[PDB]
């Protein structure tokens, strides 16, 4: 349910780990960029330690090699913006003719001009409206988060919830999440996991 | 030489019903395989069903493939739709069947599973505030089509989600200089509900 | 298990069938037996073989699947159940490009293991898809088979111990064998184009590959070869890293395969998967596969005339097929003057061979037959009593 991601500046290098365990011979690496078709970048022959690239690809950009056990590793050099995407490893199954994919890894490269500064959650909590509380014996408190980077974010809530889609406030993002709660005297916590926090945020809610 | 085209970009169907996702491919090979995968928002690429060129139409649980080798059409149908069926569905073409073979994918088609067809329910409309930000919250409505207008700095697209009762809830947030008196009005199912009504 | 890697796209030296007509078992009138016509050594593969009883075609006739020898020539066994009598005469009738008329041959009543796959693709211009036949052996035992003209269009079992494989097995082998088929079909077209051969003519592409394990069951040797029209085209060298190509055309294939890493892929298959499935098959069929039957040998003596006779040294009911029969005369080896027949299948999993020399009368005792077979504790030396 959680997204694996790696964020690197352009010009830098990035290492992604194939989380896929028959110690099979051939493993294929795919790029999936938004609105495009997943495409194979190369594959690795683990018996001969050979990297085979698709046509049109620099011999100096990608590489892949084995590591501890069933973890294979993929490396990109001289990062540019174009390299952002979801990277998959996959291997044809022995049991049944299926190509198995491991959970992909999202690579965000950061543009040169990026002011890499406070890109943590920027909270703003909203208290129920009068009509709600008076008219149906329930209350909605809405935790709003803005000015955070990158879109990867998770929000929970405790003493089931829905949320919006993160959207692009200039070059940072926002996402809100609301609830309706007997538990109107109590108070609730909005629990936000974000990489640039490095611990989870716990946001307090008033009583209504 | 080999290509995969998924014309539809998105598709929406209600619960318990069935949706059909079309796919057209181009291959020079005599015998080949077609695969249908499911991509989760967490990024898992899950295998769903495989169809051989020389096999009969594939059926595997709630998935079925209408194969037409003449037209080179391999449409996947998902019967008895569940809310967790909401994902991006990819059609992929194999080659000969070597362990060195790549899959040629199409761009995906997003499937969104809607609550069942039900009688129309008019919502309640509320305004929420924190300094300049004012959020209009619209509770328990059916159908999905609604226009939420806060009558007045910036406005974001509303969020519509499926409610635990099988209808919809929606929240629209914005920033307005005259925020303290701004209230919300919503046009839904040919009727208009104002926050001032409540 | 067929390879799933290493298979990639790239005159007719005609040779006459040798023909043997024989019975599976020593013939005894009134006891049921099988009559065999073994035809071997021929190229190309279009052949017509009928068995005759008193001149008439026997209707119920089976044949083995097409396979071929190290010189790429083909062999087939035709056989039928039959009960011999004193009066009835049996024969085999064969027709082939290399024969001006059908040949009738009369019946005359008196340590290591390997897995190998053979593939033959025959273009049939104006007669449809190319014919494709794939057979798999463990040592000298066929266990699987595909024939493009058969009804199933599936890999099929030919040994009891492979019948227990799962449906994942038969689907996967059917996938990979059909991949081999389509590769060969592209090759027939391409190769024919390159040599500017007419589209009307039939041509053959042949492929053989496999692996040997020694008695420890660890990888010992691997092979992979490719012929066009019964002639060497390209072959993996014993190191499984480089290629030998004879033709000029085969050199473009050699560069293609060097750049595509075909030999590395084959090596990964031949040293790993091939050996592992060989071990699985050897275990699953150990009662049949891990046996040796020593040859049962004897000598016959037929008087040609008053001044010479034929001494024929027989080896019967042996397994595996590899065997050496040598004649010496006063300790001088007589290979050049020895009639030596091809090793031939009995039909029940054993094999048969004989070797004859013509000896002047009264000097039989100078001639020695020498038999070498793995199932023999020591090599045998036969001599004629009188
Ligand atoms: C609802 O839409 C119809 C469309 O023909 C219109 O006639 C009707 O007046 C609308 N309802 C109201 C309350 O205006």
- The token pair at C315 is 């080896």
CATH number of the domain enclosing B16: 2.60.40.10
User: In this structure, are residues A25 and A48 in contact, taking their beta carbons and an 8 Å threshold?
Assistant: no
Best mutation target among B56, B99, B102 (most C Cβ atoms within 10 Å) is B99
Domain co-membership, A27 together with A87? yes
- The residues that bridge with B103 in the sheet, in sequence order, are none
Instruction: Give the domain range for residue A174.
Output: 116-208
**Same domain for B63 and B73?**
yes
- Report the topology of domain C111-291: 3.30.500
- State which residues form the domain around B127: 118-198
- For residues A120 and A200, what is the distance between their CA atoms, to the nearest angstrom? 11
Are residues A148 and A198 part of one domain?
A: yes
What is the distance between the alpha carbons of residues C139 and C378, in angstroms, rounded to a whole number? Answer: 22
B123 and B104 together in one domain:
no
Q: How far apart are CA B8 and CA C184, in angstroms?
A: 38
Q: Is C258 helix (H, G, I), strand (E, B) or coil?
A: helix
Neighbours of C (≥3 Cβ pairs closer than 8 A)?
A, B
Residue (of C159, C162, C205, C212) closest to C180 by Cα position? C205
Q: Which residues of A touch B50 (CB under 8 A)?
A: 97-98
In this complex, do C268 and A45 lie within 8 Å of one another by their Cβ atoms? yes
Pair A108, A120 in one domain:
no
Q: Which two tokens stand for residue C20?
A: 């043997």
Single residue among A115, A146, A181 that ends a domain in this structure: A115
Distance from CA of B119 to the nearest CA of C (A): 49
| Interface contact flag, A95 C168, Cβ < 8 Å | yes
By the 8 A CB rule, do C190 and C249 touch?
Answer: no
B184 and B156 inside one domain: yes
The CA-based angle A93-A94-A98, given to 5 degrees, is 30
B18 and B7 part of one domain: yes
Could you tell me if A174 lies within 8 Å of chain B, comparing CB atoms?
yes
Q: Which residues of chain B make contact with C175, given a CB cutoff of 8 A? A: 33, 97
Q: Are residues B98 and B127 in the same domain?
A: no
Q: Which experimental method was this entry solved with? A: X-ray
Which of A62, A91, A115 is the endpoint of a domain?
A115
The answer to whether residues B194 and B161 belong to one domain is yes
- Which residue among B100, B117, B134 closes a domain? B117
Please tell me the total count of domains within chain B: 2
Round the CA-based radius of gyration of chain B to a whole number and report it.
Answer: 23
Contacts 24+ apart (CB under 8 A), A178-185: A178/A126, A178/A140, A178/A141, A178/A142, A178/A143, A178/B137, A178/B171, A179/A140, A179/A141, A179/A142, A180/A138, A180/A139, A180/A140, A180/B139, A181/A138, A181/A139, A181/A141, A183/A159, A184/A133, A184/A137, A184/A138, A184/A139, A184/A208
- The residue out of A81, A99, A115 marking a domain boundary is A115
**Count of domains forming chain A:** 2
CATH topology of domain C13-110: Immunoglobulin-like (2.60.40)
Q: Does domain C292-386 have CATH number 3.40.50.720?
A: no
Considering only alpha carbons, which residue of chain B is nearest residue C183? Answer: B96
**How remote is the CA of residue B190 from the centroid of ligand 1, in Å?**
7
Asked if A171 and A91 sit in the same domain, the reply is no
Neighbour-count burial of B110, counting CB atoms closer than 10 A to its CB (0-12 exposed, 13-18 middle, 19+ buried): middle
For every residue of chain B, DSSP letters joined together read --EEE---SEEEEETTS-EEE--EEE---SS-EEEEEEE-TT--EEEEEEEETTS---EETTEEEEEETTTTEEEEEE-S--GGG-EEEEEEE--S--TT---EEPP-EEEEEEPPP---BPPEEEEEEETTEEEEEEEEEBSS-EEEEE---EE-PPEEEE-TTSSEEEEEEEE-TTGGG--EEEEETTEEEEGGG-
Structure tokens, C256: 């293609």
Taking one residue from A and the other from C, the number of pairs with CB-CB distance under 8 angstroms is 25
Tell me which of B98, B117, B136 is where a domain ends.
B117
Q: Give chain A's count of helices (H) and strands (E).
A: 1, 18
For residues B106 and B37, the answer to whether their CB atoms sit within 8 Å is no
- Tokens representing residue C169 in the block: 């097995």
Phi, psi of B90 (to 5 degrees): -110, 135
- B152 CA distance to ligand 1 centroid (A)? 26
Residues B81 and B133 in one domain: no
- Which of B48, B82, B117 represents a domain boundary (last residue)? B117
Collapsing DSSP states into helix, strand and coil, what is residue C188? helix
Q: How far apart (Å, rounded) are the C-alpha atoms in residues C227 and B26?
A: 32
| Contact between C265 and A95 using a beta-carbon 8 Å cutoff | no
* Token pair for C383: 């001599």
Same domain? A3 vs A104 = yes
Q: For residue B126, how far is its CA from the centre of ligand 1 (angstroms)? A: 25
Same domain, yes or no, for B129 and B180?
yes
Residue B90: closest C-alpha in chain A: A37
- Considering only CA atoms, which of B135, B115, B151, B138 is closest in space to residue B188? B138
Query: Is there a single domain that holds both residue B155 and residue B140?
Result: yes
Taking the C-alpha atoms of residue A33 and residue A40, their distance in angstroms, rounded to an integer, is 12
Chain B stretch 43-62, residues whose beta carbon is closer than 8 A to a beta carbon of chain C? 54
d(CA A184, CA C285): 74
Q: Does B147 lie in the same domain as B53?
A: no
A126 and A98, same structural domain? no
Residue B67 and residue B142 in one domain: no
Task: Give me the CATH number covering residue A13.
Answer: 2.60.40.10
**Whole-angstrom Cα distance, residue B56 to residue C178?**
17
User: Which residues of chain C does CATH 2.60.40.10 include?
Assistant: 13-110, 292-386
Distances (CA, A) of C76 to B85, C67, C121, C345: 56, 7, 16, 10
A132 touches chain B (CB under 8 A): yes
Nearest CB neighbour to A97, from listed C175, C265, C272: C175
Chain A: closest CA distance from residue B96 (Å): 12
In a shared domain, residues B100 and B142? no
B97 chain-C contacts, CB cut-off 8 A: 4, 175-176, 178-179
What sign for the dihedral angle of Cα B76, B77, B82, B87?
positive
Q: C180 to chain B: nearest residue by CA?
A: B96
């Amino acid at each position: 349910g959680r997204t694996k991601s790696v964020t690197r500046p352009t010009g830098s290098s990035a290492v992604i780990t194939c989380d896929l365990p028959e110690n099979a011979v051939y493993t294929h690496w795919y790029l999936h960029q938004e609105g495009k078709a997943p495409q194979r970048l190369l594959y690795y022959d683990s018996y001969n330690s050979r990297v085979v690239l698709e046509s049109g690809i620099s011999r100096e950009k990608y590489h892949t090699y084995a590591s501890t056990g069933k973890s294979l590793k993929f490396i990109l050099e001289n990062l540019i913006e174009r390299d952002s995407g979801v990277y998959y490893c996959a291997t044809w199954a022995s049991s049944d003719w299926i190509k198995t994919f491991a959970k992909g890894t999202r690579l965000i490269v950061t543009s040169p001009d990026k002011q890499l500064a406070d890109v943590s959650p920027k909270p703003t909590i909203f208290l129920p409206s009068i009509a709600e509380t008076k008219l149906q014996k329930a209350g909605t408190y809405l935790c709003l988060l803005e000015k955070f980077f990158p879109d990867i974010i998770k929000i929970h809530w405790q003493e089931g919830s829905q949320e919006g889609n993160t959207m692009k406030t200039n070059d940072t993002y926002m996402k809100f999440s609301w609830l309706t709660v007997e538990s109107l005297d109590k108070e609730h916590r909005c629990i936000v996991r974000h990489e640039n926090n490095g611990i989870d945020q716990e946001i307090i809610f008033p009583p209504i | 030489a080999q290509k995969v085209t998924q014309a539809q970009s998105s598709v929406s169907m209600p619960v318990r019903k069935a949706v059909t996702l079309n796919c057209l491919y181009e291959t020079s090979w005599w015998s080949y395989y077609i695969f249908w995968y499911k991509q989760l928002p967490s990024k898992e690429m899950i295998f769903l069903i495989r169809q051989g060129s020389d096999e009969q139409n594939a059926k595997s649980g709630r998935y079925s493939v209408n194969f037409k080798k003449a037209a080179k059409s391999v449409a996947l149908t998902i019967s008895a739709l569940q809310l967790e069926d909401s994902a991006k569905y990819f059609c992929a073409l194999g080659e000969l069947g070597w362990d060195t073979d790549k899959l040629i994918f199409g761009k995906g088609t997003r499937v969104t599973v809607e609550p069942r067809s039900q009688p129309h329910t008019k919502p309640s409309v509320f305004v929420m505030k924190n300094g300049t930000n004012v959020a209009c919250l619209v509770k328990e409505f059916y159908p999905k089509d609604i226009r939420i207008n806060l009558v007045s700095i910036t406005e974001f697209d509303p969020a519509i989600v499926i409610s635990p009762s099988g209808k919809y809830n929606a929240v629209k947030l914005g920033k307005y200089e005259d925020s303290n008196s701004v209230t919300c009005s919503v046009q839904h199912d040919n009727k208009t509900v104002h926050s001032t009504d409540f | 298990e067929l390879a799933g890697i290493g298979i990639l796209t790239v005159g007719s030296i005609q040779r006459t069938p040798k023909i043997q007509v024989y019975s599976r078992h020593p013939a005894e009138n009134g006891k049921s037996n099988f009559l065999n016509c073994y035809v071997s050594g021929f190229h190309p593969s279009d052949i017509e073989v009928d068995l005759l009883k008193n001149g008439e075609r026997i209707e119920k006739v089976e044949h083995s699947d097409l396979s071929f020898s190290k010189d790429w020539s083909f062999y087939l066994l035709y056989y039928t159940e039959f009960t011999p009598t004193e009066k009835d005469e049996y024969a085999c009738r064969v027709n082939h490009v290399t024969l001006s008329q059908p040949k009738i041959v009369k019946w005359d009543r008196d340590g290591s293991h390997s897995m190998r796959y053979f593939f033959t693709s025959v273009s049939r211009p104006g007669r449809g898809e190319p014919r494709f036949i794939a057979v798999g052996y463990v040592d000298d035992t066929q266990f699987v088979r595909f024939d493009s003209d058969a009804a199933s269009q599936r890999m099929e079992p030919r040994a009891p111990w492979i019948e227990q494989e799962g449906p994942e097995y038969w689907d996967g082998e059917t996938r990979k064998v059909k991949a081999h088929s389509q590769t060969h079909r592209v090759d027939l077209g391409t190769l024919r184009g390159y040599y500017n051969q007419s589209e009307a003519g039939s041509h053959t592409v042949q492929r053989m590959y496999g692996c040997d394990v020694g008695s420890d069951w660890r990888f010992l040797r691997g092979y992979h070869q490719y012929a066009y029209d019964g002639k060497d085209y390209i072959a993996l060298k014993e190191d499984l890293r480089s290629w030998t190509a004879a033709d000029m055309a085969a050199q473009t294939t050699k560069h293609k395969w060097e750049a595509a890493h075909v030999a590395e892929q084959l090596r990964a298959y031949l040293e790993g998967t091939c050996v592992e499935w060989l071990r699985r098959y050897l275990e699953n069929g150990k009662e049949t596969l891990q046996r040796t039957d020593a040859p049962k040998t004897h000598m016959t003596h037929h008087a040609v005339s008053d001044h010479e006779a034929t001494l024929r040294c027989w080896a019967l009911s042996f397994y595996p097929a590899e065997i050496t029969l040598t004649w010496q005369r006063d300790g001088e080896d007589q290979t050049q003057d020895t009639e030596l027949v091809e090793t031939r299948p009995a039909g029940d999993g054993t094999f048969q061979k004989w070797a004859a020399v013509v000896v002047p009368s009264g000097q039989e005792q100078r001639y020695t037959c020498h038999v070498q077979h793995e199932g023999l504790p020591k090599p045998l030396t036969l001599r004629w009593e009188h």
